[PDB]
Design a protein around this ligand. Structure first.
Ligand SMILES: Cc1cc2nc3c(=O)[nH]c(=O)nc-3n(C[C@H](O)[C@H](O)[C@H](O)COP(=O)(O)OP(=O)(O)OC[C@H]3O[C@@H](n4cnc5c(N)ncnc54)[C@H](O)[C@@H]3O)c2cc1C
Ligand SMILES: Cc1cc2nc3c(=O)[nH]c(=O)nc-3n(C[C@H](O)[C@H](O)[C@H](O)COP(=O)(O)OP(=O)(O)OC[C@H]3O[C@@H](n4cnc5c(N)ncnc54)[C@H](O)[C@@H]3O)c2cc1C
Ligand SMILES: Cc1cc2nc3c(=O)[nH]c(=O)nc-3n(C[C@H](O)[C@H](O)[C@H](O)COP(=O)(O)OP(=O)(O)OC[C@H]3O[C@@H](n4cnc5c(N)ncnc54)[C@H](O)[C@@H]3O)c2cc1C
Ligand SMILES: Cc1cc2nc3c(=O)[nH]c(=O)nc-3n(C[C@H](O)[C@H](O)[C@H](O)COP(=O)(O)OP(=O)(O)OC[C@H]3O[C@@H](n4cnc5c(N)ncnc54)[C@H](O)[C@@H]3O)c2cc1C
Ligand SMILES: CCCCCC[N+](=O)[O-]
Ligand SMILES: CCCCCC[N+](=O)[O-]
Ligand SMILES: CCCCCC[N+](=O)[O-]
Ligand SMILES: CCCCCC[N+](=O)[O-]
Lengths: 430, 430, 431, 431
């Protein structure tokens, strides 16, 4: 077993840090000046353009698909460094990556070639979105007996017709509310969009993913695709993840990602389990920024006393706790993404690892940021320090990407309850 | 022992809720359009005016002093109702109360009558402020052989001359930066400001409190009193607590609160100890608002499932923990204020109880808000719910009114280390 | 609102202290030498005798019923002082109090007069036991569609017949395994013990409670009431709460405590909810003993340094946290018992408050003992300090008297889910 | 970066498991019937014999030193497997390894060859102990201006004369109180023992380590080496770690490990930092036993309900939390041991990682056991389940091997406070 970073991982770190310091630090000057969530997102466009030019969107797609992704550990390193500086634009990159994932993961070369093409060109500012989340919630979307998804799809001739509402998926409406360059819309199949989900069919058997591009939208009536609103978020105030209504929205059958059923659900589940492990790196970036800011402060400030405040056991205790949280978190993230790249391990072992990772790292990042503030004291509460921003940004992570309480803990619980559950398979082999 | 409330305690609650609901709810529409801390503060002036008209500033002064305060438990009840709805203005009220406290606690009847008049008249928008905190910090203000307060006073003829900077004291610059109506300025006596505090003199013996009014500031040259800035706060975004510089600022001897030294230190400690005990009520208000919004949601929303989310054990576990924190918190606050009113108890005993209360209630309120957010899920993160506001507001509490880590725990530790420490004196007697 | 203690409350404290210091301190020298759980229990009989002589058993019974209980705050105060010194015998008193409660709470003066008699007497060593817990667990005893209690009673003639097993109930087999002087046996009504509980009927409507005495056991075959075993406990090593099998156990119909069904469930619920509130005083006692031993050590030992270890911010932080946990706990117990005594409040308001109390106090007392040990350091891990005993005894509280995970959180959760739940009714009332 | 285990790592695991299952599981029958700590330790001797026979003591010693230790990860794997079954004898193995460490780490090939020979032999039951801890504590042994270690040494002629007391060092008295085969005794140099440590000289500059064999003790007056007692511990009840008194105890100069001073301190510090990382594996084993017992239970028991208790979210939550603590803990131990092995890293970087590991894994192991107990509920509290043992055993870890509060957080704090502190140097490399 080894923890040593290769030259290309060190170089990926160097490159991510250089990009964040020279490009991302300037985003705040542009977006802070804007009035609402969409305008803040829009003032972020020149910085995503730079991200594209730095090869960062191409790095979200595997090499066999024409991208430059080196490995998931490389990716973990990048996100940490990005998020330790500025989640604006960084968020847009990872949300794009998530929106690409169902295409990346499907076993269909013609779809991949066609739909991933903008994202590997090194040009423009193409956006992708994985549109799963809804106004009514999604934690119980697979509950047998439940109403299931409320965005539904039905086949009419050689096309599918989308009826329903999405909320929260980042990037979904693109820069201009005319749509992301690629959207994967997760629907529950329903011949009659008025009828309740049959309580005798397993909901997983009814999942479809339909690909929607700016063209798919242009080919529909204006009112088939409506942006009803843009949430005003506590943190990550420069991301767009609007409220969208599909009314009789027409999609060619050839934009169906795969066969409806367990296979489509399986693509969603896999995309989101990967996000589950990677999200830890984002949480670590934010929590690390908080810890480093409080550490530097405690090593250089006496707070009107005779010694630097780090010399006070109660201050040191907080920073020790912060440090431990960060170190365990990063090890767990590298363990998780590594577990997910292991072809010899069954899916349930990977899924369990991914769930643990999202839960621990996101819960713990919050404590880390709050302990850092308590260490600094009153000064941390004002916006001449990073902490007010970090506080709001860190509370996103346990709630988003499938909240820990409703989704990730129940996904994990379900695995552990299975008769063939092997707790240590990812460590000691099966 | 008895927990029952009197008809007048119940009336204070009703009176406070009604004021909050009918008046304070309207403040957001006014302050939300202003684009800085001072402008947001100024936008709250009409609500503090209404607070005065409702007798709330008068209720901060005890009855023997011409005020209408019935007890500390009434006060706790009022603050909880107020902070449960809107800390805008509510914060101005308690900051005034703290500002008035050295005068209320001192025992010069004619000084009291003179300086408390505007606050018991039921007219205008009079502000008070206890100016203690400094740019360099104050956790070590009493550390022997340390720098001490960087705000310093010297006697010159019939007058005192203040040199130095304050930062954070709410209300200190008034509505218009010409000063609060009454500011109690905490100084370290020093004949030569350019020389360090004498390391062989106990810091507590050099403490003086000087009363500075709008007239005092008007009697000075323009560059003797200046606002250098106004912190942009994570939460409580409508309060004012600026960065003030005193340069050769002249104050009349008749404005000295009491003889410099231990009695002046004790006036400060007592004011901040009362505040330590009452601040729990503010924290309870904020956390209760979170808990109740979460509870209501959890009993009305299935999150696309077949039952209300309160029916899920993990969700209910969060609300349970929330409830418990709030209930233990309120009990401890009532215990604390009651202990402070008990004339048969030593200061040591009252102080320790006051410290415990500040520490517990303020730490636990944070957890209570965050757990409520986890229970509600993604929806808690958008500003059409109150949690973004509450998350920022609740984080003030462990940091302000003497941070838990640097000040409150150290004060409690010093009591516990005393040879004659009686841990249960407040319960079972001495 | 007032936190002042009356002369009688301070006298109950002094009295309770005097007893624990002069009597209970001597108990360890006897039970320490004993081979097993039962031997250790029997070895505490002389001390329970002294508790009866000090009127402590009589103080578990209300005054209207010939006992000397002044209030639930008095009771809280007493239990805290007792458990601070020694949970041995102290546990027996309180397991007797719980055993008496369904009788204390019933609507029948004649049942009360007959059955409470030896406990208000001031003589002998009478034991009571509320026999509810079973080998297979009880957290789901009221779940519709589940197997329910596996101790069952049928009516045959002028008698009820008990079939089944009990486990854990303290005092249940008395000093000699011929039974507690009084046992309230909580049964599921089943005409055929071999048939599974009907999934169509609310389990709560099938609850019956049957009073079983040493006489009842004597009037039965010797193999109709058997003690299968005695659990060896982590802490509270001197209690007895054996594994008891009822096979065709005959009980007179006049020993039926009340009408089976929602009324008998009410009695069990009410009894355990009062236990929920008062158990906190026991947890406080144990954790207070940990805090105080750690406080004294921290204020007197430098651990080979230049200053007493309380001067180290990290050590003080631990003591602070202990203090806070204890202070918030007591406040919560007093609020809960007073809430239980307030005749103006709906039952569910009282129940929620008792549930909170049990949950907070028992969880937090474990934290309090462990932080106390961390503060003392390595020394705390050796049996010349109290901590090894306290650690073991403290871990009982979150698990016994209805564990927090399975039972008390679920009871609380049910209340909160009700359409007319009033979170603050016990503080502010109502409508 | 790589997490995959090699064939020899997987074999090391299999071998440790086999030994734990077939040998160590039989240990309890023998020690349970003994009366006190020493007797329980002595009853353990034949299992330690079997451990030597299985190569496990030899595997505590690096290959270039004659041993068979393949790496610290191999070591970590072994310790977790052993401690997941039975810490009796297992603790004796690791206490010996600690005792061997200052010798293993010194730079003298002849001294190593001489003093390590018994331990690489494959025969007997040789014991080693690092005797550092003292009655008055050691958290402050390096505090300038403090009393310092109370066990002092001074040179008289061609020998050293030890005066004072040790407390806690496992194995220190050997099987029979005539001494461990090898004991490294840590002393503060002092010409007049009745005079206080000079407040002007750095305590670290005054540290010496003298090797004490059974022969050294044989060559002294009988009352020069006295065992004054044997602590009764809450857990790990089969270990011996006596109170020892040295009175004018003569040791040959050839038994001095190195010149007194910073180099001697450094060897003690490096020994205890290696232990600090590896103790995590011991904590993980104990807490893993607790988690697996609770998990198996949750998956096979409905607790009188209709579904296995793992289906209740609150139960699931506990098990999820235990699982996360264990996973994060093992990763951090492997990270930390691999950090200690990296020749390219500064010591401060290694030290900091080792302190983090000890603090986190040991605190978090206690939580894991407790949560597991809470999820099993009342059944976890009786000695027919593992938990009572597990609870007492797990509480040792935050306290021993340098307590978290007094020592490990202070060691970590000092490193963090240094001008040149690089937080991420073990991850991203130095600058
Ligand atoms: C910046 C940002 C970017 C995002 N990106 C995307 C994206 O690209 N695509 C996308 O689809 N979504 C996206 N999301 C949404 C995110 O994935 C959310 O996690 C998702 O909406 C699910 O939220 P939830 O876990 O709160 O579930 P909800 O269904 O909203 O449930 C809320 C709460 O109900 C309770 N609950 C409900 N059911 C249960 C149960 N069975 N058991 C226990 N508790 C239960 C839980 O306490 C839970 O927290 C984004 C959100 C943000 C803020
Ligand atoms: C809305 C608002 C209203 C306010 N009202 C007032 C007011 O009316 N009057 C007023 O004077 N101030 C006011 N303040 C400031 C408030 O009282 C702060 O608590 C005060 O500034 C002290 O800050 P601090 O506790 O962080 O101490 P600091 O001196 O700034 O120390 C900061 C941190 O350093 C560490 N530290 C320093 N010394 C030690 C030590 N010896 N031991 C251990 N750790 C140490 C601790 O981590 C501590 O948190 C207000 C602030 C706000 C935001
Ligand atoms: C010293 C001592 C004295 C005692 N005194 C008495 C007495 O006088 N009378 C008496 O009757 N008993 C007594 N007991 C037993 C005590 O009341 C226990 O609390 C009782 O057995 C119930 O235990 P439990 O809550 O662990 O439930 P169990 O049914 O054993 O459940 C065990 C675990 O399963 C899980 N679980 C089961 N169902 C659910 C669910 N629905 N939702 C979530 N989790 C679930 C929980 O994690 C729970 O902790 C005593 C025990 C001891 C050690
Ligand atoms: C099974 C077992 C095996 C052991 N093996 C060995 C061995 O092989 N060799 C050996 O030498 N010892 C051994 N020990 C002892 C063990 O290493 C202890 O950790 C050691 O005694 C130090 O204990 P301590 O950390 O509590 O220090 P102490 O000096 O006893 O301090 C105790 C407490 O005081 C407080 N404190 C003291 N100073 C400070 C400070 N400056 N700052 C903050 N807080 C402070 C802390 O709260 C601390 O926990 C063993 C013990 C056991 C039970
Ligand atoms: C790679 C992970 C990006 C996180 C996307 C947000 N979300 O899934 O809710
Ligand atoms: C009673 C009001 C307390 C508010 C004062 C805030 N502070 O002291 O920092
Ligand atoms: C009033 C004290 C309750 C005794 C505990 C018995 N039990 O319910 O498990
Ligand atoms: C790996 C060594 C642990 C055994 C002794 C621990 N200790 O130093 O106290």
């Amino acid at each position: 077993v080894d923890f040593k970073l290769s030259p290309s991982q060190l170089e990926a770190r160097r490159h991510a840090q250089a990009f964040a310091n020279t490009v991302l630090t300037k985003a705040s000057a542009e977006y802070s000046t804007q009035k609402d969530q969409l305008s803040r997102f829009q003032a972020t466009r020149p910085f995503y353009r730079e991200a594209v030019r730095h090869g960062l969107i191409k790095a979200q797609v595997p090499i066999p698909l024409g991208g430059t992704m080196e490995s998931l550990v490389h990716e973990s390193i990048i996100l940490e460094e990005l998020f330790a500086v500025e989640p604006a634009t960084s968020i847009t990159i990872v949300a794009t990556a998530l929106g690409l994932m169902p295409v990346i993961l499907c076993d269909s070369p013609s779809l991949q070639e066609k739909f991933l093409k903008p994202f590997i060109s090194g040009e423009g500012e193409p956006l992708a979105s994985l549109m799963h989340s809804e106004p009514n919630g999604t934690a119980n979307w697979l509950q047998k007996g439940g109403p299931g998804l409320q965005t539904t799809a039905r086949k009419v001739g050689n096309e599918w017709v989308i009826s329903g509402e999405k909320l929260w998926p980042s990037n979904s409406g693109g820069w201009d509310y005319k749509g992301a360059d690629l959207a994967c819309v997760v629907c529950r199949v329903s011949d009659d969009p008025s009828k309740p989900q049959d309580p005798n069919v397993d909901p997983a058997t009814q999942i479809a993913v339909l690909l929607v591009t700016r063209e798919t939208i242009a080919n529909n009536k204006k009112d088939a695709y409506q942006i009803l609103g843009e949430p005003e978020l506590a943190g990550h105030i420069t991301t767009s993840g609007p409220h969208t209504r599909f009314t009789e929205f027409h999609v060619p059958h050839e934009n169906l990602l795969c066969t409806p059923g367990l296979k489509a659900q399986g693509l969603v589940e896999t995309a989101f389990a990967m996000a589950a492990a990677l999200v830890g790196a984002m949480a670590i970036g934010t929590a690390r920024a908080a810890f480093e800011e409080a550490l530097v402060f405690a090593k250089s400030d006496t707070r009107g006393g005779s010694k630097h405040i780090i010399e006070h056991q109660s201050v040191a205790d907080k920073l020790i706790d912060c440090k431990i949280r960060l170190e365990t978190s990063r090890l767990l993230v590298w363990k998780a993404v590594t577990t997910l790249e292991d072809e010899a391990l069954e899916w349930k072992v990977k899924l369990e690892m991914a769930m643990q990772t999202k839960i621990y790292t996101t819960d713990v990042a919050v404590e880390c940021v709050i302990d850092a503030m308590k260490a600094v004291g009153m000064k941390s509460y004002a916006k001449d320090m990073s902490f007010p921003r970090l506080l709001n940004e860190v509370m996103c992570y346990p709630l988003f990407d499938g909240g820990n309480i409703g989704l990730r803990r129940r996904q994990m619980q379900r695995v552990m309850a299975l008769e063939d559950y092997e707790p240590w398979a990812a460590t000691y082999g099966s």
